[PDB]
Symmetry: none
Subunit: 252 residues, 2 copies
């Protein structure tokens, strides 16, 4: 009442599970081979009936391409995203990822070749561009390599100014577009410490704040002699303001 090994089917291998005898009614399914994917709505299973006789079954395997290769720019559309049977002459449609944009002139579709390959994908999905970094007052923006999605920029200040904020920004995908990860920082005027007050002398028309390269002029009182640099200026070293040198002396 049992059947022997099931029939032979081209491009298909029956899943016996190590067994050699199959009891009546036992249903065996065939599994296609590499480069093969069972045709939809096509029987791939036999059923052992009376007289130790397996039912009838005809080739159900066809040649097909593997699942489209993952692309960083575009992702498959429905329902190709869940398919596996890519009979030759089949098209798969892609949809730009986040954050990439479609290149009108290029087709987002793909096709399956004879040696089981695909149509080399174009650049249908380009990288989304970021907003102009802008300008930094008394600072600079280093754009090593463009401002496209995944790009990076760095910040620096002009001599005499200190950096307050982020030293770099990234073009990251935000919502429906790419946006710079951090805000444009600020370059703060590095002010020098209030100039030293000297004995018997004064500061010719002082000042509220002394910045980089700004000088302080000194003047002795009546009956005193100036012995030294008539004035000093502000130097900046490591975002640190420092006076050029020692103030002058007002010898009596």
């Amino acid at each position: 009442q049992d059947c022997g090994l099931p029939p032979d089917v081209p491009n298909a291998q029956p899943a016996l599970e190590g067994r050699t005898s199959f009891p009546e009614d036992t249903v065996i399914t065939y599994k296609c081979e590499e480069s093969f994917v069972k045709i939809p709505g096509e029987k791939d299973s036999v059923i052992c009936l009376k007289g130790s006789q397996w039912s009838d079954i005809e080739e159900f395997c066809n040649r097909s391409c593997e699942v489209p290769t993952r692309l960083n720019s575009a992702s498959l559309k429905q329902p190709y995203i869940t398919q596996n049977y890519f009979p030759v002459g089949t098209v798969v449609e892609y949809e730009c990822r986040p954050g990439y944009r479609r290149e009108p002139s290029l087709s987002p579709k793909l096709t399956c070749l004879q040696n089981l390959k695909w149509s080399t994908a174009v650049e249908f999905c380009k990288k989304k561009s970021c907003p102009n970094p802008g300008e930094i007052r008394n600072g600079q923006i280093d754009v090593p390599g463009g401002i496209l999605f995944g790009a990076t920029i760095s910040f620096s200040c002009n001599t005499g100014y200190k950096l307050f904020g982020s030293t770099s920004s990234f073009c990251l995908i935000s919502g429906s577009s790419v946006q710079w990860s951090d805000p444009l920082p600020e370059c703060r005027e590095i002010y020098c410490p209030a100039p030293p007050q000297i004995d018997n002398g004064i500061i010719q028309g002082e000042r509220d704040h002394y910045g980089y390269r700004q000088s302080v002029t000194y003047a002795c009182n009546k009956g005193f002699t100036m012995i030294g640099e008539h004035s000093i200026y502000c130097t900046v070293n490591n975002d640190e303001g420092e006076w050029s040198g020692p103030p002058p002396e007002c010898r009596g």
Copy 2:
């Protein structure tokens, strides 16, 4: 002939090594130290007939030496030509060039009883020069005031070069004190135009690059930077030199 002339207090006859003087021979007496001859008085004798010298009374009086030379002031007329400074004598001074009178102080001097002049005050001060001024991107070193005879030097802030005199002198000029040289100039030492690299560019290029200023490079699409992405203008001996070599844009 007459023998040696008579003896006169505080005075010594100029005989010239002689011992015998022929008639009419006139001999003059020269006062001694601390002694100056009174004006208009006889200071001479004459050998007359009878081997008899002429008459003569004392003609020297006590006096101070000529006022000592002062750097600030110079004697006035007519003291500038006098020599007879009997005690209780006043000489008047007049400021030199270039000194200025000190109102509160007397420019006069008195011949003290001990044949010494009254210690001179500072009636004549040194004339002050005009304020050196301010040097843009430079400095003025006033080692010792700006008075007459003073000296000031000049230097430039880092990044600027000196063009002109390195010093000036408060020399005497006309009827006042004036600086010997003009206030020089400090010229920004500009670096050579930044090198242009292959396959790259200069981010926000500039007209002139000064001290500490930097140039940032960027590679075109498809190229990769090779080296330091920026250079800063250094200055060495009023000479502008780039920090180093520009980056490279490798394809």
